[PDB]
Design an enzyme around this catalytic site. Sequence first.
Site, short mmCIF file in Angstrom:
data_model
loop_
_atom_site.label_atom_id
_atom_site.label_comp_id
_atom_site.label_asym_id
_atom_site.label_seq_id
_atom_site.Cartn_x
_atom_site.Cartn_y
_atom_site.Cartn_z
N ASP A 205 -4.85 11.70 -5.95
CA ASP A 205 -5.29 10.49 -5.28
C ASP A 205 -6.47 10.82 -4.35
OD1 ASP A 205 -5.44 8.17 -3.67
OD2 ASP A 205 -3.38 7.60 -4.13
N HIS B 170 -5.50 0.25 -12.81
CA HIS B 170 -6.03 0.33 -11.47
C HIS B 170 -7.48 0.78 -11.48
CE1 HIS B 170 -6.10 0.74 -7.11
NE2 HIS B 170 -6.28 2.05 -7.23
#
Lengths: 304, 306, 305, 305, 306, 305
Positions: free
Chosen positions: A145, A218
């Site tokens: 991330d 996403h």
Amino acid sequence: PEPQMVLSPLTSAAIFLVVTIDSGGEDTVRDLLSDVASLERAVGFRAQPDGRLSCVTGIGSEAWDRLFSGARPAGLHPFRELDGPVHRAVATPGDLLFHIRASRLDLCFALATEIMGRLRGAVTPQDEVHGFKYFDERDMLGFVDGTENPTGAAARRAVLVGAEDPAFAGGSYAVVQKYLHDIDAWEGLSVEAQERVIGRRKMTDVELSDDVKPADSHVALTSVTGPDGSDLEILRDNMPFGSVGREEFGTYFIGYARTPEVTETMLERMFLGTASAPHDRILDFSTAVTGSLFFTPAADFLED
Amino acid sequence: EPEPQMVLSPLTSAAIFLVVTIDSGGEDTVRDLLSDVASLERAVGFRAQPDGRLSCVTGIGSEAWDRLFSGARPAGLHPFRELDGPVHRAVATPGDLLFHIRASRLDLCFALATEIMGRLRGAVTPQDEVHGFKYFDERDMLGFVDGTENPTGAAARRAVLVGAEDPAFAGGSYAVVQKYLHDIDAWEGLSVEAQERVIGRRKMTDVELSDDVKPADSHVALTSVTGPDGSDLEILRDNMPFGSVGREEFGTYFIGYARTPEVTETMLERMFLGTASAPHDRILDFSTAVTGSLFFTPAADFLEDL
Amino acid sequence: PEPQMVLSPLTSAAIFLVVTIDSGGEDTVRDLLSDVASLERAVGFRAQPDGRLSCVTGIGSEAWDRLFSGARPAGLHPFRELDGPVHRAVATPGDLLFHIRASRLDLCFALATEIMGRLRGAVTPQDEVHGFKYFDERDMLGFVDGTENPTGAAARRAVLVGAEDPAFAGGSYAVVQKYLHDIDAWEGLSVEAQERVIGRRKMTDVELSDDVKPADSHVALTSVTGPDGSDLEILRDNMPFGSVGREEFGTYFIGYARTPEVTETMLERMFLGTASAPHDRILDFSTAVTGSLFFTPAADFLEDL
Amino acid sequence: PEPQMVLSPLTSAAIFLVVTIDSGGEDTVRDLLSDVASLERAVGFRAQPDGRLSCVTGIGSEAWDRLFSGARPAGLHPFRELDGPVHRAVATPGDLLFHIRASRLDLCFALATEIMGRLRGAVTPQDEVHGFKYFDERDMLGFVDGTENPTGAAARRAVLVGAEDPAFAGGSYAVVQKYLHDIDAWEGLSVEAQERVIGRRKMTDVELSDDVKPADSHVALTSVTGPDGSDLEILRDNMPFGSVGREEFGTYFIGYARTPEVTETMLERMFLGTASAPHDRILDFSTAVTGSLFFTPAADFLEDL
Amino acid sequence: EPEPQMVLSPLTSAAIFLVVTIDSGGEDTVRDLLSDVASLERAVGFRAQPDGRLSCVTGIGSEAWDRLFSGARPAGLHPFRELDGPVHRAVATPGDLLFHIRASRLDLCFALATEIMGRLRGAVTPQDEVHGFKYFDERDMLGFVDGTENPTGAAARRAVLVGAEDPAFAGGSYAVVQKYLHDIDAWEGLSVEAQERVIGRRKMTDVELSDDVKPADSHVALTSVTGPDGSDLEILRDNMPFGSVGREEFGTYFIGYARTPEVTETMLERMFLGTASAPHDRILDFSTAVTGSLFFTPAADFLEDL
Amino acid sequence: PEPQMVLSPLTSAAIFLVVTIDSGGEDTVRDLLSDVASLERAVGFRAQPDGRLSCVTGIGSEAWDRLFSGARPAGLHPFRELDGPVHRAVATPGDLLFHIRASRLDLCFALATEIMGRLRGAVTPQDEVHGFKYFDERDMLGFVDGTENPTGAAARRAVLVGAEDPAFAGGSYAVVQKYLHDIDAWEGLSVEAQERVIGRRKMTDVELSDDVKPADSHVALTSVTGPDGSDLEILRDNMPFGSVGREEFGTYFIGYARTPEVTETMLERMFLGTASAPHDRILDFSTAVTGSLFFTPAADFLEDL
Ligand code: HEM
Ligand code: HEM
Ligand code: HEM
Ligand code: HEM
Ligand code: HEM
């Protein structure tokens, strides 16, 4: 002009503090704002050279008007609540943000203690999160991330106010949202189905090819080009947090950008969707419970 | 653009400070060595990449300069002036060359100092050698965090490096050194609270005392000097503890870099001669300066092209 | 007779989990007890050599009676509430203790997740604390904390059950108490006053000499000699925790001893006092909000379930 | 018996402190000796887990009789001066030795400060050396230094007093000598000549084969067999030190052994020579300027006082 | 405008050097790969923030350039020129693409190499693959500290990066690679003193011999080249040791970056063909080049612009 | 009897060197065997305290008989080729094994250079692999590898020869096999399918429940109980290795055990299968290209030559 540490990398520890200013607390707050860099150095110098302590201070739209008269940053406005057909990005109260990072939690805690000691009786705490690194820069969904954050000169251009608002050059805009995840639902997906929600391979962090990446993934939805050609970029310093007994597994989202329009465009795409995607599939496993927008001024503005 | 020596570099765990005087006839040998000092630094330092962090800053005193160099002289370069206050004195002691050697390990500093001194043997006389070490969380021998308010980034460059005011020496800096010995027996007789009033900051946490409680003769009050621009005058300090337990020697080696000596000198005057508000800096009731010298640290390309 | 990791050193991160076992959750708990070592290796092996992950599992008196049918450890009983004239050591519910340590919080958190995943629907959480090292092994009162812990053979002798209770050799007893501190009151004391409360110098951690050390100082009251002239020792793995917005500045006390009697004697001196001392001055700045006693069996005991 | 940290490895930093005890200093000294373990922990605990602080305390022959009544260790005597035909091993005053080691000089310095602060007025300093690691465990001659030190069980057997002197079991004997080196002369030798002086390869630390190793090489003369043909070993914790301005390039020699006879036999061989070798060639580049012998008692001997 | 690849970055403890040729009709797959290499670098490297230090520098050879790209070529780009001295030969070997992969850990290098080669399978043929490792204190297989005189800071940018002399390719660089094998048996038959005279530096301490003892045929003497103005011409070397003890392969993987190949070529000419006073570099009496290739490493934005 | 470093943990770097002894090279090899401890110390000491250098030396069955006279270890025989219906465990030549480990490859390489330098002209290299740690203790299949290795007393009991063969107490048996993997095929499987091949979760390394764990899964087939109900364990120090250009993605398997029969029983189950499994599914993606068996004598045996 000298920015705050908005360009600095992810660290292994963070404290995010959001407070509201009580009626009559304005003077106390102003005095703390003028001291916050001093306090950071007071604590941070102790842990040269590996401590990496920083504090970014942000001010909300309504707070700005209570604290200062005259010039306002051009993009400063309250967080815009987005009520999608299925998912909602809530706007929650927040006047000041302290984004505190270091290589160790003690430094962050010691600084937060000093800050809050000076504000006791003038503010009310709204949120406090202690974030921690999770393995190889993973989030609580198990994905790496931060990968596509801009670096170097591209980061500077994406994040720092410049000649479009020159009195505020060196500032930035921070959007925060505290997300809780449904880990039980997420773990019921196969790895391959998780990859299709995110748009990258789970173990190796390699982006899915365009022929395979879903439109409602996403990465697809947060990939935006402006009328101009260029990708619109933001700098994210998201951290995991949680509590196992309460089944609380969270991502604390914080994104910095030169104008909030970039971050807002991304949020609109995620929560309201496009012609080819109803909403970001990550929100089927992620609930936003806070949302606030702050301006993080150049360091010298605060020093006054 | 000229390349500075490493005067903007942070504090390290280990340091050697070497001050020597140049013997009569030694000038040629010194010039040769000055031209080679960067090469010597790389020869040792490259071995310990990437965490060695070896550096050497070389400085030249006023009298030395006049002996070494026919040509232009830095505009602010003069001998250190003795400050003879009613009670405390800032002594001026001999020093022609300074080598400020830092690394993350003493062995690197020692090896480089060995190489430098080997070259200079028979052309110089050692005056002072100090082996500094980090003490806990950046503390000095008084137990306080030491270096907190040093400038960083752009502000440090502006405070430390010579610029267009002295263009031939752009990228240089001025270093002042003083070796201080502390009276630790007297100091440790004070409460923590009384020590905080001497310094002007909280001891454990390093937070500045509020202006309403900080005495006018505290160290931080007297070394806080406002310039014409409304801003405090800044220096960069690379102070290191040193000592020897058997001889009761507990020391701070002061070294401060600034773009002009007038800044450091103003602070020294306030400390030693006082103000209307303050007879002298209370830190000096527990600290004795035993050396004092001023050096110019030229741009690295200056040294290279001798 | 292989002990759990009760002799291991302080780490920079810890998670303390205390749960109660729901009615009918006994079988699930027994299955998890039998697998906890396997789970620890599953997470921990990922981060060798520097992860230093360990988990110590404890079982309370009441839970023991619900889980096991055979003999009980000789010293196992519920934590005893101490009601002093001024301060109280409360007894709070707790059936199972997980004392999880590593050099990084993520390993503790990952292990805790795996344990609680197994237990969901069988246990109710009572307390969870995420501890962190604070500068140079300091506590939230700003003192170095842990100094006089026993090491080596003296630790083994002080901590591990031996021939006195041979069926349970290699076990230990853990007492936990979560303390919250009144930092505003504490910071109103001079450093010298704080030194007299603790019994050691603040910055350097050197013990005050016996002539200056007050009799109601913490160190004086928790220094206990045995009938044999010999110091009674415990092994403390205290960690700081807190939350700045709530003004929560905490010490999570955990102490291991071969018999609870040692730890209890110390608590009695602190809370009830002595001829010389009404109570431990530390308690004028510290409130205990939990109090539980657990037995931490030998590793093979848990494996053989 | 618990030994002092005599078997502990080389560290990156050390302080060696040698003092003599003034008139009437004995009570002050005894009081410090009883407290040194406590002081070590006070400082050392602050730098868990990587500080590696230790302090070994030694007591010389004359000082023993001043401090303690009754039994003496069997091998304790004043260092014996060796006046060779060329080189001399000098004896110099020394009543107490503190050998302080850590991974960082600050810890050593802090501990030395606390020890000396307690001894002010009672002792006179004789020597103080601040030793530092030099590259990959080298000495000032540029050789790797310590390679053949014993480890493990062999180390315990070579170093700790046992049943041959049972009242003092767990003690050891330290000999110290400060050596200053003639680096100008040494550096006038080829590397190949230096390797013949030492008896090992310079860069790689590999021992020269017996075919090639000279009989007056350092390694040949310090390799000694007991009458039963077994190798006599000592444990050396020597450290480099120096001052560049004074041209002072030193080896601080400290060697531990279960009896001083072993260390004395090596010194005799080095300074006085053998049938095949007039003296150790390392002494043509190394001058001893101190020499003292101490007994380092078991830790519990010191605590008990 | 101009963003270099990581050609200025320091030595690391691990490296992989991969040299491949492009197969007929593999041009499209390679173009695609090239446009994604930065993405792959980030995908692998972000996992090991902050200490991983993963980078990848991608180079394109002369013949490859004309098969891949339409339009302008870099001014300096040509095939490696074989150098047939009397005794020693600098061979030219095939190589279209270079991947110079560095990190603090081999796993990161290997993982990125795996991703790159997975994309290229079918389109390229491997020519060479070397896994380099740090050896003690930055030593090479001859036992000497290797890298010492690399330029740093502004001097490195000036020496390595293409500028105004070829503006379409500003921010690029030229890399020459040569894989050397050493004859360690012969080398270790020399005294240290003899070894130092081949190299021109002290072995143990890495201090340069003074020029007044440095042999004219020493490696340092011959690779010291003064340009027109008397300025040193400099290259940036990221050489790494490699080897296999079982086959007695003790190697130096040479890689040198420069803003023009002429600098590196002059040095190679001096080595292999010698000067007035020196027939050839004595280092070559103990080292054999078995590969030789030249690559242009474009600005990062060029590759991304595909 | 002191063992070689066969119980020591995994390291981030390794060199495995397998050689055969040329006719006439026996004397040269014996001399080297007596010096290998020496050599290890010579190199290793330079990188105190974190180098972690070790070398274990193994000797195969045929070599043993050429080097030694008299009694032989009870289980020492040539590796037994396994010809399964589908997959084969090949036997390849190898007389000596050097298993070299450290925290850094340079240390491994330096020691290997020294060893091989002593053996030039006496031996022919058969295999050399440079292993490297891969992320969080993963293998080339992407799974964490080493988790269920025994530790402590259980490791000692599993790996060291004891009273069953008293002349060779303190030794061990090492089996080595170099495996190459078909990563293209492997990557065609879902994560969930891969997990069913191994018997553990890929990311988190938790073992699959009994109920869902396939009979032909690796973990099921290498889980073996003896006649007395005890678990038969081995200690594995396998390392990844590879070459991307040549598409060589490897696991270098090395397993230590007190008798070859334990490791042989596991290999039989893998390659020839059981009642409910034709073979280990891991072999559908892994090919063995070497196979050799060595006895690793106690360290004192080597020194005594
Ligand atoms: C709900 C929790 C969130 C999670 C767990 C999450 C997770 C991730 C992951 C795993 C990636 C892929 C790797 C990477 O490049 O970082 C990613 C990319 C990204 N995320 Fe999120 N994200 C979340 C919320 C947000 C929000 C609220 C925004 C913007 C308002 C955002 C913007 C982005 C952007 C711009 C990228 C890079 C896409 C690209 O260019 O490839 N994320 N996120
Ligand atoms: C005598 C030995 C000295 C000691 C032990 C000492 C120690 C300290 C300490 C503990 C501080 C507060 C923390 C910090 O900002 O560094 C301080 C501040 C400072 N010292 Fe000193 N100091 C010494 C001498 C000097 C000298 C000789 C000068 C200048 C000529 C000087 C200039 C400063 C300045 C500029 C500051 C920062 C003041 C501010 O802006 O807050 N010091 N020193
Ligand atoms: C508010 C909770 C506590 C705090 C902040 C605290 C803090 C400290 C400190 C700073 C020390 C001195 C350094 C050391 O040796 O560790 C200490 C010592 C000690 N504490 Fe506590 N403590 C607390 C509660 C307890 C409790 C509940 C017990 C026992 C039931 C205990 C037993 C001890 C013992 C045995 C010592 C060592 C005394 C000695 O022999 O010198 N502490 N503690
Ligand atoms: C044959 C294998 C090679 C080895 C083992 C080797 C080794 C060394 C060593 C040990 C040094 C001295 C320290 C330093 O790096 O500054 C050196 C310097 C140097 N080498 Fe090499 N080298 C090799 C090949 C080359 C090649 C092929 C070139 C150029 C084409 C080259 C160019 C240089 C340069 C420019 C210097 C710096 C000289 C100076 O300015 O002081 N080397 N090399
Ligand atoms: C072919 C390449 C091999 C690979 C990639 C491999 C990989 C693995 C993995 C990932 C595990 C599970 C985690 C662990 O406990 O280590 C495992 C377990 C195991 N492997 Fe293998 N292995 C291989 C070959 C072998 C061989 C040849 C043997 C024995 C002759 C063996 C014996 C074991 C044993 C005993 C276990 C532990 C099973 C248990 O008790 O849970 N492996 N291996």
